[PDB]
């Protein structure tokens, strides 16, 4: 999409409809006459376009009204309302841009942000952009959290997020113009290779893949057409539904052979009954021939009974000789049909043992994408976010995805090595208590009007708590925390001095020997300028390889590489890194997933801010003080970077509207 309509699409907004959110800020216009809605909608779309056309500088209201034209630029307040709305909620003037209007000398309001992850940084920048006092507390000695980048010498490799998923509607597209990012397209061609090191032939590779995709659709049919979503009071997972589908396909194969050979016996038996008729007929014809022979032996001239006997027996023998001939047509037809069936047997199996293993790889890929064993993904809801998918190629970051958080952190008050440990929120304000990670003795106290919590969901899940909430979080929040899924997925960075792989393939697979180890090192990435291969550990394997030393892992890595390219071809790696995100205490996993028994509504629960009880009883109901953001908080884009970032921008607008007021709602 191009024009002002493209700006709306590139902003995840319908160009010809007002969103639920715009309704809330412009309830005059949405209940108003339809012409004004078109006015407003154009003014929004145009303003997005201006910002989108050049996002390296701030888009001031003044600049906006200038490029606007009549009759759209007749009503300044409408334009000021629109521009201010967009500015507040991070649809314009977000990310890293030059300031036309420099910062106000005096800040208003104080907010503590826990976590220096992209969610964190994005809100922090926005709040400071709005004139608030922002301080970020970070337990690590670096920013970016789950956007980690390994850098040594000229080697560079992200151990965290490494993929941008298509720039059509992606906010990271704006950040790309703002920060130079070596954005390199991912060539989707992925050769598989088995345990033996020999590649799968294009016959299988496409037959199995297409079966995989067929198997997935099968489950959607079970889910949406057959309401197969509970089983013995427990919700059905994708994994279960896949087995049930496979079992039923194996069943149908057997059902098919049974009625095939039962077609044969129905015919063999029709033949049996036919031959028995033919023996018995031949034995009668044996007997009449003797009788006719004997009658012919009486030499003539005979009396007419004896002449009648010869003729009568001769008639009878040719009538039985006729029967036996017709029955031998009927055995010929039936003998031909038996050969035909004996030659068109149905399919022997559903999938062969080799075929099932290639299928396992395609499942490991799915376990990678959702960072969890398929046995945990909700069948009904696991793909609820497929509807908001971005358009375009998937990309990778050549220069290390850490360049983005680092760039956002510029200008911000960040306390590294500062492990938040208790959050106190009350009707009059909040207190955050953190320790120093190096010497846990040295205790810090932060007082502020509001806390934004971007703590990973794995951290929020931890029992016993790594962070104590005072007062405790209400059940509706803690239950959302239990229901949701926090998955796991680890990487292994292999630093060589020779390129020894196909440089024209970005990524190539390894097929596991068993279902159980289907995700153990099942995939490799050639993504960097230096000779660096990067190997995934997904699924049930992820959590298990975390109890195995690097050397053993890098060993198994070399062995698989030797099988694909020969022992001479691959040398020992100069530098090796192995991640353990479930072990990492500031992550306790990789990203969230829609657990069975959860739903997308939990992602909305996670985002509702907490409002504490009144101090003096009978005092008026207070402001909300605890706010939540992060990848686990954004229902339509979970478990991504862009989703984190959007959630930051979200809360920043929400906090601001609460402590600074929104004059654009009149």
């Amino acid at each position: 999409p191009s024009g002002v309509e493209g700006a709306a699409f590139q902003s995840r907004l319908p160009h010809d409809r007002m969103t639920s959110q715009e309704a809330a800020c412009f309830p005059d216009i949405i209940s108003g006459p339809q012409q004004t809605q078109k006015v407003f909608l154009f003014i929004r779309n145009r303003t997005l376009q201006l910002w989108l056309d050049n996002p390296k500088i701030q888009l001031t209201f003044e600049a906006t009204l200038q490029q606007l034209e009549a009759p759209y630029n007749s009503d300044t307040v409408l334009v000021h309302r629109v521009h201010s709305y967009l500015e507040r909620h991070g649809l314009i003037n977000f990310g890293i841009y030059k300031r036309i209007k420099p910062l106000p000398t005096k800040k208003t309001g104080k907010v503590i942000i826990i976590g220096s992850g992209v969610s964190g940084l994005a809100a922090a920048r926005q709040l400071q952009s709005f004139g608030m006092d922002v301080t970020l507390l970070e337990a690590r000695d670096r920013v970016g959290g789950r956007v980690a980048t390994f850098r040594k010498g000229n080697y560079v490799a992200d151990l965290g997020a490494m993929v941008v998923t298509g720039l059509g509607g992606n906010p990271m597209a704006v950040v790309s113009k703002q920060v130079n990012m070596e954005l390199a397209k991912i060539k989707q061609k992925c050769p598989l290779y088995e345990a033996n090191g020999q590649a799968v032939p294009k016959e299988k590779d496409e037959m199995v893949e297409q079966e995989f995709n067929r198997l997935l659709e099968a489950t959607s049919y079970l889910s949406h057409q057959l309401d197969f979503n509970v089983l013995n009071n427990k919700p059905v997972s994708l994994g279960q539904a896949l087995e049930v589908v496979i079992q039923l396909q194996e069943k149908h194969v057997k059902d098919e052979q049974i009625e095939h050979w039962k077609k044969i016996v129905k015919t063999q038996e029709e033949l049996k009954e036919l031959l028995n008729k033919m023996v018995n007929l031949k034995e009668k014809i044996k007997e009449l021939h003797q009788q006719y022979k004997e009658a012919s032996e009486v030499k003539p001239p005979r009396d007419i009974t004896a002449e009648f006997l010869v003729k009568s027996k001769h008639r009878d023998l040719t009538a039985l000789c006729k029967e036996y001939d017709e029955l031998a047509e009927t055995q010929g037809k039936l003998e031909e049909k038996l050969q035909e069936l004996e030659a068109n047997p149905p399919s022997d199996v559903y999938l062969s043992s080799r075929d099932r293993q290639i299928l396992d790889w395609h499942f490991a890929n799915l376990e990678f994408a959702n960072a969890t064993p398929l046995s945990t993904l909700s069948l009904k809801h696991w793909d609820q976010d497929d509807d908001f998918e971005f358009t375009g190629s998937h990309l990778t970051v050549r220069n290390g995805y850490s360049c983005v958080p680092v760039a956002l952190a510029e200008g911000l008050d960040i306390k590294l090595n500062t492990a938040v440990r208790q959050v106190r929120y009350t009707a009059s304000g909040c207190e955050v208590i953190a320790v120093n990670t190096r010497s846990t003795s040295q205790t810090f106290i932060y007082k502020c009007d509001a806390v934004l919590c971007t703590l990973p969901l794995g951290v929020l899940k931890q029992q016993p708590p790594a962070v104590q909430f005072v007062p405790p979080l209400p059940e509706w929040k803690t239950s959302a925390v239990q229901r949701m899924g926090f998955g796991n997925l680890n990487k292994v960075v292999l630093c060589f001095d020779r390129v020894f792989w196909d440089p024209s393939v970005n990524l190539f697979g390894h097929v596991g020997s068993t279902t159980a180890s289907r995700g153990e090192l099942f995939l490799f990435w050639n993504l960097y300028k230096a000779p660096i291969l990067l190997a995934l550990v997904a699924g049930e394997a992820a959590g298990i390889m975390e109890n195995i030393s690097d050397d053993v892992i890098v060993g198994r890595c070399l062995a698989i590489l030797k099988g694909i390219f020969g022992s001479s071809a691959v040398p020992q790696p100069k530098e090796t890194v192995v991640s353990r995100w479930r072990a990492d205490p500031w992550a306790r996993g990789s990203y969230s997933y829609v657990a069975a028994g959860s739903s997308g509504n939990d992602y909305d629960l996670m985002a509702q801010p907490i409002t504490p009880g009144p101090s003096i009883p009978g005092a008026p109901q207070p402001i909300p003080r605890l706010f939540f953001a992060g990848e686990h908080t954004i229902r339509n884009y979970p478990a991504t970077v862009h989703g984190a970032l959007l959630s930051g921008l979200r809360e920043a607008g929400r906090i601001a509207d609460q402590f600074l007021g929104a004059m654009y709602t009149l």
């Binding site: 659709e217 039923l248 049974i258 033919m278 023996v279 023998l317 009538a319």
Partner: protein, 133 residues
């Protein structure tokens, strides 16, 4: 609304495989037993029908009798009349067979014969005697 081509998923089928935990392998085992069953019941009758197929060697070639070709006369020799009356008693009303015996009379003549000479060869009685068997 319809499952993907090549995928067999019926409501009836799915309970049957999810009734318990092992209801999957239980259902598959019975089908494995059902096939092996039918499989050897084929080679049973394959060998039964192999013996029957051998007893019929040579077919009936030695017992065949040459085709007699007669142009089809119209006058009734006293001989041909007597053949007829005996044919009726042995064969009832199978005129094709009765004509076959006489060999020189076409079927229509036999029916006519049944009336013209019906009194004199006392047919009516003969048919009743043929009815008695």
């Amino acid at each position: 609304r319809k499952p993907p081509k090549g995928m067999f998923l019926s409501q009836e089928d799915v309970e049957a495989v999810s009734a318990n935990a092992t209801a999957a392998t239980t259902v598959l085992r019975q089908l494995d037993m059902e096939l092996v069953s039918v499989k050897r019941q084929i080679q049973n009758i394959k060998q039964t029908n192999s013996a029957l197929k051998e007893k019929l060697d040579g077919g009936i070639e030695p017992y065949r009798l040459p085709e007699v070709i007669q142009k089809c006369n119209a006058r009734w020799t006293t001989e041909e009349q007597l053949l007829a009356v005996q044919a009726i008693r042995k064969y009832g009303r199978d005129f094709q067979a009765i004509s076959d015996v006489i060999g020189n009379k076409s079927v229509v003549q036999v029916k006519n014969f049944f009336v013209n000479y019906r009194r004199r060869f006392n047919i009516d009685e003969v048919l009743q005697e043929w009815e008695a068997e």
